[PDB]
Design an enzyme around this catalytic site. Structure first.
Site, PDB file in Angstrom:
ATOM      1  N   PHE A 189       2.005   9.848   3.094  1.00 51.77           N
ATOM      2  CA  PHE A 189       2.417   9.801   4.480  1.00 51.77           C
ATOM      3  C   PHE A 189       3.013   8.455   4.847  1.00 51.77           C
ATOM      4  N   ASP A 190       2.814   7.372   4.068  1.00 55.33           N
ATOM      5  CA  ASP A 190       3.361   6.063   4.384  1.00 55.33           C
ATOM      6  C   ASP A 190       3.296   5.148   3.168  1.00 55.33           C
TER       7      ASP A 190
ATOM      8  N   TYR B  40       0.818  -1.205   0.000  1.00 58.94           N
ATOM      9  CA  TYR B  40       0.000   0.000   0.000  1.00 58.94           C
ATOM     10  C   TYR B  40       0.853   1.257   0.000  1.00 58.94           C
TER      11      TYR B  40
ATOM     12  N   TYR C 287      -9.639   7.864  10.795  1.00 57.69           N
ATOM     13  CA  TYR C 287      -9.299   8.451  12.093  1.00 57.69           C
ATOM     14  C   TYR C 287     -10.196   9.597  12.549  1.00 57.69           C
TER      15      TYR C 287
ATOM     16  N   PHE D 235      -5.740   5.297  -0.386  1.00 59.92           N
ATOM     17  CA  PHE D 235      -4.742   4.235  -0.357  1.00 59.92           C
ATOM     18  C   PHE D 235      -4.622   3.608  -1.726  1.00 59.92           C
TER      19      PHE D 235
ATOM     20  N   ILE E 159      -8.364  -0.079   9.975  1.00 61.41           N
ATOM     21  CA  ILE E 159      -9.490   0.856   9.922  1.00 61.41           C
ATOM     22  C   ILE E 159     -10.615   0.230   9.095  1.00 61.41           C
TER      23      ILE E 159
HETATM   24  C1  LIG Z   1       0.291  -2.182  18.061  1.00 63.96           C
HETATM   25  C2  LIG Z   1       0.874  -1.094  17.592  1.00 63.96           C
HETATM   26  C3  LIG Z   1       1.585  -0.976  16.233  1.00 63.96           C
HETATM   27  C4  LIG Z   1       0.877  -1.566  14.971  1.00 63.96           C
HETATM   28  C5  LIG Z   1       1.662  -1.210  13.717  1.00 63.96           C
HETATM   29  C6  LIG Z   1       1.870  -2.011  12.681  1.00 63.96           C
HETATM   30  C7  LIG Z   1       1.424  -3.480  12.527  1.00 63.96           C
HETATM   31  C8  LIG Z   1       2.615  -1.477  11.488  1.00 63.96           C
HETATM   32  C9  LIG Z   1       1.668  -1.069  10.346  1.00 63.96           C
HETATM   33  C10 LIG Z   1       2.419  -1.171   9.008  1.00 63.96           C
HETATM   34  C11 LIG Z   1       1.165   0.372  10.622  1.00 63.96           C
HETATM   35  C12 LIG Z   1       1.978   1.527  10.014  1.00 63.96           C
HETATM   36  O1  LIG Z   1       3.246   1.676  10.673  1.00 63.96           O
HETATM   37  C13 LIG Z   1       4.273   2.260   9.845  1.00 63.96           C
HETATM   38  C14 LIG Z   1       1.233   2.865  10.111  1.00 63.96           C
HETATM   39  O2  LIG Z   1       0.212   2.847   9.106  1.00 63.96           O
HETATM   40  C15 LIG Z   1      -0.357   4.142   8.809  1.00 63.96           C
HETATM   41  O3  LIG Z   1       0.676   5.013   8.415  1.00 63.96           O
HETATM   42  C16 LIG Z   1      -1.290   3.778   7.634  1.00 63.96           C
HETATM   43  O4  LIG Z   1      -0.952   3.949   6.461  1.00 63.96           O
HETATM   44  C17 LIG Z   1      -2.651   3.209   7.917  1.00 63.96           C
HETATM   45  O5  LIG Z   1      -3.576   4.028   8.088  1.00 63.96           O
HETATM   46  N1  LIG Z   1      -2.875   1.880   7.973  1.00 63.96           N
HETATM   47  C18 LIG Z   1      -1.831   0.858   7.740  1.00 63.96           C
HETATM   48  C19 LIG Z   1      -2.229  -0.021   6.570  1.00 63.96           C
HETATM   49  C20 LIG Z   1      -3.565  -0.645   6.919  1.00 63.96           C
HETATM   50  C21 LIG Z   1      -4.609   0.447   7.100  1.00 63.96           C
HETATM   51  C22 LIG Z   1      -4.235   1.396   8.236  1.00 63.96           C
HETATM   52  C23 LIG Z   1      -4.521   0.728   9.564  1.00 63.96           C
HETATM   53  O6  LIG Z   1      -5.570   0.120   9.728  1.00 63.96           O
HETATM   54  O7  LIG Z   1      -3.521   0.828  10.447  1.00 63.96           O
HETATM   55  C24 LIG Z   1      -3.769   0.231  11.758  1.00 63.96           C
HETATM   56  C25 LIG Z   1      -4.197   1.286  12.775  1.00 63.96           C
HETATM   57  C26 LIG Z   1      -3.262   2.476  13.040  1.00 63.96           C
HETATM   58  C27 LIG Z   1      -5.371   1.093  13.363  1.00 63.96           C
HETATM   59  C28 LIG Z   1      -5.925   1.954  14.468  1.00 63.96           C
HETATM   60  C29 LIG Z   1      -6.034   1.025  15.659  1.00 63.96           C
HETATM   61  C30 LIG Z   1      -6.703   1.761  16.801  1.00 63.96           C
HETATM   62  C31 LIG Z   1      -8.134   2.042  16.389  1.00 63.96           C
HETATM   63  O8  LIG Z   1      -8.846   2.638  17.457  1.00 63.96           O
HETATM   64  C32 LIG Z   1      -8.172   3.025  15.242  1.00 63.96           C
HETATM   65  O9  LIG Z   1      -9.545   3.281  14.894  1.00 63.96           O
HETATM   66  C33 LIG Z   1      -9.809   4.614  14.430  1.00 63.96           C
HETATM   67  C34 LIG Z   1      -7.319   2.482  14.104  1.00 63.96           C
HETATM   68  C35 LIG Z   1      -2.493  -0.535  12.240  1.00 63.96           C
HETATM   69  C36 LIG Z   1      -2.139  -1.620  11.179  1.00 63.96           C
HETATM   70  C37 LIG Z   1      -2.772  -1.183  13.659  1.00 63.96           C
HETATM   71  O10 LIG Z   1      -3.852  -2.124  13.567  1.00 63.96           O
HETATM   72  C38 LIG Z   1      -1.559  -1.904  14.192  1.00 63.96           C
HETATM   73  C39 LIG Z   1      -0.518  -0.980  14.811  1.00 63.96           C
HETATM   74  O11 LIG Z   1      -0.771   0.185  15.146  1.00 63.96           O
HETATM   75  C40 LIG Z   1      -1.082   4.718  10.030  1.00 63.96           C
HETATM   76  C41 LIG Z   1      -1.475   6.175   9.833  1.00 63.96           C
HETATM   77  C42 LIG Z   1      -0.190   4.588  11.267  1.00 63.96           C
HETATM   78  C43 LIG Z   1       0.482   3.199  11.450  1.00 63.96           C
HETATM   79  O12 LIG Z   1       1.407   3.170  12.573  1.00 63.96           O
HETATM   80  C44 LIG Z   1       0.832   2.750  13.832  1.00 63.96           C
HETATM   81  C1  LIG Z   2       1.526   4.928  22.531  1.00 59.99           C
HETATM   82  C2  LIG Z   2       0.749   3.931  22.911  1.00 59.99           C
HETATM   83  C3  LIG Z   2       0.078   3.794  24.289  1.00 59.99           C
HETATM   84  C4  LIG Z   2      -0.637   5.044  24.893  1.00 59.99           C
HETATM   85  C5  LIG Z   2      -1.366   4.662  26.173  1.00 59.99           C
HETATM   86  C6  LIG Z   2      -1.432   5.398  27.274  1.00 59.99           C
HETATM   87  C7  LIG Z   2      -0.755   6.759  27.535  1.00 59.99           C
HETATM   88  C8  LIG Z   2      -2.252   4.899  28.433  1.00 59.99           C
HETATM   89  C9  LIG Z   2      -3.634   5.572  28.498  1.00 59.99           C
HETATM   90  C10 LIG Z   2      -4.133   5.556  29.953  1.00 59.99           C
HETATM   91  C11 LIG Z   2      -4.593   4.809  27.548  1.00 59.99           C
HETATM   92  C12 LIG Z   2      -5.412   3.657  28.153  1.00 59.99           C
HETATM   93  O1  LIG Z   2      -4.576   2.531  28.466  1.00 59.99           O
HETATM   94  C13 LIG Z   2      -5.080   1.704  29.535  1.00 59.99           C
HETATM   95  C14 LIG Z   2      -6.516   3.176  27.202  1.00 59.99           C
HETATM   96  O2  LIG Z   2      -7.562   4.154  27.252  1.00 59.99           O
HETATM   97  C15 LIG Z   2      -8.824   3.709  26.703  1.00 59.99           C
HETATM   98  O3  LIG Z   2      -9.231   2.548  27.387  1.00 59.99           O
HETATM   99  C16 LIG Z   2      -9.720   4.922  27.034  1.00 59.99           C
HETATM  100  O4  LIG Z   2     -10.454   4.935  28.024  1.00 59.99           O
HETATM  101  C17 LIG Z   2      -9.711   6.119  26.126  1.00 59.99           C
HETATM  102  O5  LIG Z   2     -10.502   6.096  25.163  1.00 59.99           O
HETATM  103  N1  LIG Z   2      -8.901   7.176  26.341  1.00 59.99           N
HETATM  104  C18 LIG Z   2      -7.970   7.281  27.486  1.00 59.99           C
HETATM  105  C19 LIG Z   2      -8.314   8.504  28.313  1.00 59.99           C
HETATM  106  C20 LIG Z   2      -8.218   9.704  27.392  1.00 59.99           C
HETATM  107  C21 LIG Z   2      -9.228   9.565  26.262  1.00 59.99           C
HETATM  108  C22 LIG Z   2      -8.960   8.318  25.422  1.00 59.99           C
HETATM  109  C23 LIG Z   2      -7.782   8.573  24.507  1.00 59.99           C
HETATM  110  O6  LIG Z   2      -7.700   9.630  23.896  1.00 59.99           O
HETATM  111  O7  LIG Z   2      -6.876   7.588  24.504  1.00 59.99           O
HETATM  112  C24 LIG Z   2      -5.740   7.772  23.603  1.00 59.99           C
HETATM  113  C25 LIG Z   2      -5.939   7.008  22.297  1.00 59.99           C
HETATM  114  C26 LIG Z   2      -6.166   5.490  22.358  1.00 59.99           C
HETATM  115  C27 LIG Z   2      -5.902   7.730  21.183  1.00 59.99           C
HETATM  116  C28 LIG Z   2      -5.969   7.156  19.792  1.00 59.99           C
HETATM  117  C29 LIG Z   2      -4.639   7.519  19.164  1.00 59.99           C
HETATM  118  C30 LIG Z   2      -4.646   7.096  17.710  1.00 59.99           C
HETATM  119  C31 LIG Z   2      -5.667   7.954  16.989  1.00 59.99           C
HETATM  120  O8  LIG Z   2      -5.649   7.680  15.601  1.00 59.99           O
HETATM  121  C32 LIG Z   2      -7.063   7.637  17.474  1.00 59.99           C
HETATM  122  O9  LIG Z   2      -8.003   8.453  16.754  1.00 59.99           O
HETATM  123  C33 LIG Z   2      -9.274   7.833  16.509  1.00 59.99           C
HETATM  124  C34 LIG Z   2      -7.104   7.803  18.986  1.00 59.99           C
HETATM  125  C35 LIG Z   2      -4.420   7.334  24.319  1.00 59.99           C
HETATM  126  C36 LIG Z   2      -4.259   8.180  25.618  1.00 59.99           C
HETATM  127  C37 LIG Z   2      -3.193   7.542  23.338  1.00 59.99           C
HETATM  128  O10 LIG Z   2      -3.073   8.928  22.987  1.00 59.99           O
HETATM  129  C38 LIG Z   2      -1.896   7.097  23.965  1.00 59.99           C
HETATM  130  C39 LIG Z   2      -1.679   5.590  23.927  1.00 59.99           C
HETATM  131  O11 LIG Z   2      -2.321   4.840  23.179  1.00 59.99           O
HETATM  132  C40 LIG Z   2      -8.698   3.411  25.206  1.00 59.99           C
HETATM  133  C41 LIG Z   2      -9.929   2.708  24.653  1.00 59.99           C
HETATM  134  C42 LIG Z   2      -7.457   2.551  24.955  1.00 59.99           C
HETATM  135  C43 LIG Z   2      -6.168   3.030  25.677  1.00 59.99           C
HETATM  136  O12 LIG Z   2      -5.053   2.113  25.496  1.00 59.99           O
HETATM  137  C44 LIG Z   2      -4.196   2.401  24.368  1.00 59.99           C
END
Ligand SMILES: C=CC[C@@H]1/C=C(\C)C[C@H](C)C[C@H](OC)[C@H]2O[C@@](O)(C(=O)C(=O)N3CCCC[C@H]3C(=O)O[C@H](/C(C)=C/[C@@H]3CC[C@@H](O)[C@H](OC)C3)[C@H](C)[C@@H](O)CC1=O)[C@H](C)C[C@@H]2OC
Ligand SMILES: C=CC[C@@H]1/C=C(\C)C[C@H](C)C[C@H](OC)[C@H]2O[C@@](O)(C(=O)C(=O)N3CCCC[C@H]3C(=O)O[C@H](/C(C)=C/[C@@H]3CC[C@@H](O)[C@H](OC)C3)[C@H](C)[C@@H](O)CC1=O)[C@H](C)C[C@@H]2OC
Lengths: 107, 107
Positions: free
Chosen positions: A36-37, A26, A82, A99, A56
């Site tokens: 961006f990636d 991708y 996101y 993508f 996603i």
């Molecule tokens: C466990 C930690 C590390 C673990 C990282 C990897 C396996 C490496 C994998 C190549 C990710 C890339 O690392 C270079 C990088 O890919 C991006 O650049 C990107 O192009 C993207 O959008 N992708 C990746 C290709 C599949 C679609 C999408 C995605 O679905 O990504 C998923 C994503 C971020 C989902 C969140 C999950 C939380 C939900 O709450 C939220 O829901 C709103 C959506 C990725 C696969 C996660 O499942 C797993 C991880 O995070 C993101 C901009 C940021 C991401 O880095 C983190």
């Molecule tokens: C770097 C990795 C670890 C790092 C973890 C911590 C500091 C520990 C911190 C207590 C998180 C909790 O760990 C027990 C746990 O809190 C939840 O249970 C929760 O109640 C929640 O919703 N919270 C936490 C309280 C603030 C609001 C919200 C949030 O904003 O959370 C943020 C969140 C998930 C944002 C995503 C970021 C990706 C965007 O793309 C997406 O956008 C759609 C939103 C957290 C703070 C991230 O910024 C930082 C991290 O992830 C999530 C259900 C899952 C999360 O575990 C991961």
């Protein structure tokens, strides 16, 4: 939701099933084409499974509509990516993502 | 967006500014009250800063409307939280989240 526009056709026969591993290359970009990636830059395909909240929702629903060998552009609305938050330091709030995805195989 | 309903009033004077650290206790639950997380259970406040995409947008906009000492329920629509994807293994697709938040101090 997600719109799937085909660049190159797949086999028109093998579509991803829940519980298979999809192996893809991708490139992710914003709507203006800003990259961006890309897994192509790492020379390493990305693998994931449907049905496990591993990607996603736009990908879960876009890749399920592609057959093996297909290369497509998936345009995904913010709610299927996101949303109003974005992804820290990489994607702004309310961003539509594009993508370029190639479905290489299923395992 | 986010709706802020007050349980106990704050000082009505000190509202969070970008670049301050907010120190909070929270409990997160689904709309039916099912708890999925709480910092109160860990006996450790959660700290974060506004303006850095450190929290979901519903929190960025909900906590900015609270003053120090206030305890409020923030109800956040999916687009201001995890949208159509949810959070793997914890929050389903399209979930409205309810947070019980107490703003303890600003640093
Ligand atoms: C466990 C930690 C590390 C673990 C990282 C990897 C396996 C490496 C994998 C190549 C990710 C890339 O690392 C270079 C990088 O890919 C991006 O650049 C990107 O192009 C993207 O959008 N992708 C990746 C290709 C599949 C679609 C999408 C995605 O679905 O990504 C998923 C994503 C971020 C989902 C969140 C999950 C939380 C939900 O709450 C939220 O829901 C709103 C959506 C990725 C696969 C996660 O499942 C797993 C991880 O995070 C993101 C901009 C940021 C991401 O880095 C983190
Ligand atoms: C770097 C990795 C670890 C790092 C973890 C911590 C500091 C520990 C911190 C207590 C998180 C909790 O760990 C027990 C746990 O809190 C939840 O249970 C929760 O109640 C929640 O919703 N919270 C936490 C309280 C603030 C609001 C919200 C949030 O904003 O959370 C943020 C969140 C998930 C944002 C995503 C970021 C990706 C965007 O793309 C997406 O956008 C759609 C939103 C957290 C703070 C991230 O910024 C930082 C991290 O992830 C999530 C259900 C899952 C999360 O575990 C991961």
């Amino acid at each position: 939701g997600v719109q799937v526009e085909t660049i190159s056709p797949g086999d028109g026969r093998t579509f991803p099933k829940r519980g298979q591993t999809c192996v893809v290359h991708y490139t992710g970009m914003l709507e203006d084409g800003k990259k961006f990636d890309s897994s192509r830059d790492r020379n390493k395909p990305f693998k994931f499974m449907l049905g496990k909240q591993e990607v996603i929702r736009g990908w879960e629903e876009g890749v399920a509509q592609m057959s093996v060998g297909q290369r497509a552009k998936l345009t995904i609305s913010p709610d299927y990516a996101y949303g109003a938050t974005g992804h820290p330091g990489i994607i702004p709030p309310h961003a539509t993502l594009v993508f370029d995805v190639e479905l290489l195989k299923l395992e």
